[PDB]
Amino acid sequence: MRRSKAEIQRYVENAQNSASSPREKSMKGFLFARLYYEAKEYELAKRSVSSYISVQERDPKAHRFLGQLFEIEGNVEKAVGCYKRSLELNPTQKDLTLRIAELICTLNIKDGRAEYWVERASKLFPGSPEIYRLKEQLLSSQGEAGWNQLFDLIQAELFARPNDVYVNLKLVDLFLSNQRLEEAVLHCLKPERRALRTDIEWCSCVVRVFKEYLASKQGQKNTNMRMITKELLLAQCDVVFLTLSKKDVQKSKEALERFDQALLSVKQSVSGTDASDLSVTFYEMRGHYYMHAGTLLLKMAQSCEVQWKALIEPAALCYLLAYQVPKPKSKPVKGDDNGQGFLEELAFDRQSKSGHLLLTLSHGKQNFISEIIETFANQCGQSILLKFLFEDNLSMQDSFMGSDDISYVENRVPDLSELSQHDNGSLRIHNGDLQHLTWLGLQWHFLSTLPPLRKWLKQIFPRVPQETSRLESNIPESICLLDLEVFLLAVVQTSYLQLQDNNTTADPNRPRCLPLPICKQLFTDRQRSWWDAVYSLITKKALPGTSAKLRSVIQHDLTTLRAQEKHGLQPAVLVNWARGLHKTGYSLNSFYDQKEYMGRCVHYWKKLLPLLDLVKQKKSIPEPVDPLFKHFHNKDIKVSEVKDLEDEACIAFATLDLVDGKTEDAIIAFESVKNVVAYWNLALIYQRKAEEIENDCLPAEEQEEFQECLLKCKGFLKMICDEYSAYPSIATSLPVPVETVFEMLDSVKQSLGEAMDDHSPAFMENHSVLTTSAIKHSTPSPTKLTISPSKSARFSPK
Amino acid sequence: IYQRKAEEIENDCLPAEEQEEFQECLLKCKGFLKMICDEYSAYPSIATSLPVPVETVFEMLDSVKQSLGEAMDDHSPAFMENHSVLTTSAIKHSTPSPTKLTISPSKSARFSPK
Amino acid sequence: LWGQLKELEASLDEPNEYVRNLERRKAFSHWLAHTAEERIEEEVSLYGPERHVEAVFSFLTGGRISDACRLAQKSGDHRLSLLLSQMVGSQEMRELISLQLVDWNKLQVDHYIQEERLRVFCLLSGTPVWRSSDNRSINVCSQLDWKRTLAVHLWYMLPPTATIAQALRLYERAFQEHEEGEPYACYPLPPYLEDCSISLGDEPSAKFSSLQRDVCVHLLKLYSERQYDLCQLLDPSSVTPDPLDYRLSWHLWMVLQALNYTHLSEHRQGTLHASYAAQLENVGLWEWAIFVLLHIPHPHIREAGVRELLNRQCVVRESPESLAKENFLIHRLCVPAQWVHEAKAIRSRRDGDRHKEALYLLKGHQWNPCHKLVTRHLAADAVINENYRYLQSFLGELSNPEHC
């Protein structure tokens, strides 16, 4: 509630009538001044603080507050006077020195006081961007003597902060103002400037400088001209990409038009036989042009300028043209890896993006690419594409797209194994960006395939261990690849659920996932802040002095990822982690990797079981006010699903005991679950036991054990076939195609021979003895190494 | 442990988050291997307490340096300053008392013996 | 808050914490009603028959619903009398009055209703501040002292199950500036500052940190929060305009210590004992200043303070009053008679009376000082004047085999 002027005045009058002395009235004046300021009564606030200052002349807070009142009135000189007096009384107020410098520069840059206050501020805040701006303003007023000092200041600030876009732009403008166009070009060509390619003002400035240089040198056949034309096409492509992401549709059309004209101008200089670096870049940039054209069409559909249905087939042709551009053939020229590896990384990024978008746009239609080629891969289809992108602004002859040959397009559907290779290439350019990783993870999730997160995380974080022995630690230095994998699995799942809940009213022709430039943020700002903190800490890219703050962010949310006390996770996230880790771990041929993935899978199942008990009791699960992963009530575990998840947890425990080499404990555990997945694991155990006994000269006892193992295997395989015959829906729960179960059953029948088909001993009548002792699945607490050497591990991974 | 954690993360197409975790695991591995070399340099008698020849520690340290690349040799973040929080609760190394089999199937054992 | 309640002693079983909290809430409610009685009778006498609604409001703010009902009935306001008769124990009635206020505001009928009457309806609905359709703010607490304001929060704004601590916290939010509204309650000033028109001019947040609270609010905080600061509670400025009046502060500290409050610093305890002992010394009750000093926990500081006070105030002249004070110290306070005699010996030395000095050193068990005084200054004068019986009284007592 804002106090009214009348309430404040009644309070002041009562507080003044109760005061015994004029001095005591004035001592309350600072409180009255603050109340009048909260009421926006600045004149009464000034009178009240001035009456306080006349009794308490040595109070810095009163002089500071009086300076703030004069600043709000626009009386800068009186404000500066009051702030100087506050700073004299208390010199610890470093912020006030900066504010005095700002106010003096705003009033009169030619004031000799300005240099003194800016230099005094510079000593208090070394490398402040605001102090750089005040020094720039001062030196810009001093003509030629100011120019040399401004150049030295810019070089010093670029040495402290090489990635500052504003300081880099100012250096270029300072070269241009002195007609030093060659140095502006040399500065734009510096390899350290690749980090600035994410900024639209920088890329637009680079484009401007290179166009002006190429215009100034028209007629000179220089090798430098081909290099600058190469970098101009790259910078134009970046401007298109950034405009597609950060600007409207109309600015994106104008950016693509300028890129079209740039490609057309270079086309005459690129004969199809020249293996020149410019020719390689031109064909690479042709692929990017079509990828961006397809993205612009989908952007026009997203802005409701055109219907999705009309732009899906034209956009799919553009992604097809982009996908089919051949990768630059790397000759490994021993000695300068920095230039040619970058075009190969761009080619991988284009092919990954375009290939996933072709699969998204097809909606699983088998002949979709063929229908598009027949309809649009002709001169009439080109003329339609040109009209959609540029309307009547460009003719077929004045356009790169209109003059390009699109008739030679292959009917090539993107292969998933090739796309997985292209995705690994694309990760190098995005440097572990969470939006890129989440987008790829969603593409694989829409294909019902697990994303190869392990390969991606090993490439981004090559020094991080796969697992930690200290899951109870929340120390940031204890992070493992499995903590990052479960983080990405939950981000992808939460992004998928968020896209579904937003899509329940969307056009059936709308792509399930949009292209990265036009795709909304797939994750929360907290997920961003955690990932960027982890990335910055592990890659040692963290700003000096920020590392303590980054560690605190990591430490807080690492407790959630490890399902420590009060983790606040939704059960559906723990189920998805356990399933994802089970599938990944089971697919690995490495014993140590299988054990780590199964161990972590079992950890999340053990954390989920007490939450399933709460769901069975119909108790609500605690939701955090700000959760790392949003709760989606459409995925809340139903009481009917609790048993199937308890059985899945028991299977994962038995699989871990199997991977640990406790084969007997695993058999007993699988026999207890009485499910098709448990019978399949039992059949595999007994088959492997039979293959271990199969040596070409068995004793009669080993021959009986071999036959018993095969009979047990036949028994469990038959139970799977009998259950499948009763309920064909079980094929979705089986780890393998039902055909593989039949092939294994028929191989086991061939090995048993025809002579035993008529004697089934009652397979289940004789193990009704051992009562209830809760099998404690104990992980070993760390007891000191006592080496007893007498059991060679019997389990070689054949 | 940190070497095996890094080898589990090493798949040919890592996300940027998994690349940071991989590098952190290798830096932790380099840190502990360096501590062994520093202690051995102070007291050569430690060679009798080591489970492996000291040569195997040097070979592993040099392989981890090759995998980290030359570009990170100058930024040591203070390897021990940030884990001074969690007071004394006696870690009970409990062996499981025999509680009856309740099969919850949802953690495949992540540890294959490679 | 802490005393024996007859209602809790009437049960043979250990009373459940809920029953204790309920009977404590009733005892505190009775205390609040009694504190407002004198002022409500004055206010009701002033309002006369013409302002019967203001007199009804005054009775409601003292919990006297029965007398409010009778006054409304005598004045011819039978509708208000019927309404008030239904207020004892019905939450549904409060909700119906709240709906009625909302409907009058939506229909813009509230602007035709007398403000004093709307204020009664606001109180009965449990709404502390009401905004009329005319943008007029009706504040129920605007004419109330902090005690009646706290009582209104306990009786009308909270449920009958609410604790004293919940009522106090709601009242504290009522005079604090918050983002959600203007302060509507008075700050809990001591009674010597309640009539000081401290004009709360336009900056209130920095002034409340300097304004002392009433001792009763400090006790209510200590009851609600067992670790509440005793330094502010035991400050004389919470009670009296005189900063040297430690009377109530010292006796409150003894009672709080009997209740097992021990978190007062030893330095502040020493200040309370020394300040109240010095007040009693100035009033001429120095024998009771010794009693106050005997509560000092530290034996050496206690002993030093008691001997220092004895050395200042002990008179050598035997008056019936001086002997009554000495008998009080020795027999009631258990102060060693030796220390009283030592103080009288030091005083006799100052006065130059060597005879009385020797007598009191003897009674004080100071054998060595007594012997040195007798031999150097009394023996020669007694021998020259042939007063052998006088010298024998001192030397005879000193001649005991335990003293020699």
Automatic annotation (TrEMBL), chain A:
Repeat region (TPR), residues: 60-93
Domain of life assignment: Eukaryota
Annotated region (Disordered), positions in chain: 775-798
Sequence ranges of Polar residues compositional bias: 775-793
Location in the cell: Nucleus membrane; Nucleus, Nuclear pore complex
Similarity remark: Belongs to the NUP153 family.
Protein name: Nuclear pore complex protein Nup153
Source organism per UniProt: Xenopus laevis (African clawed frog)
Interval of the full protein contained in this chain: 1 to 798 of 2905
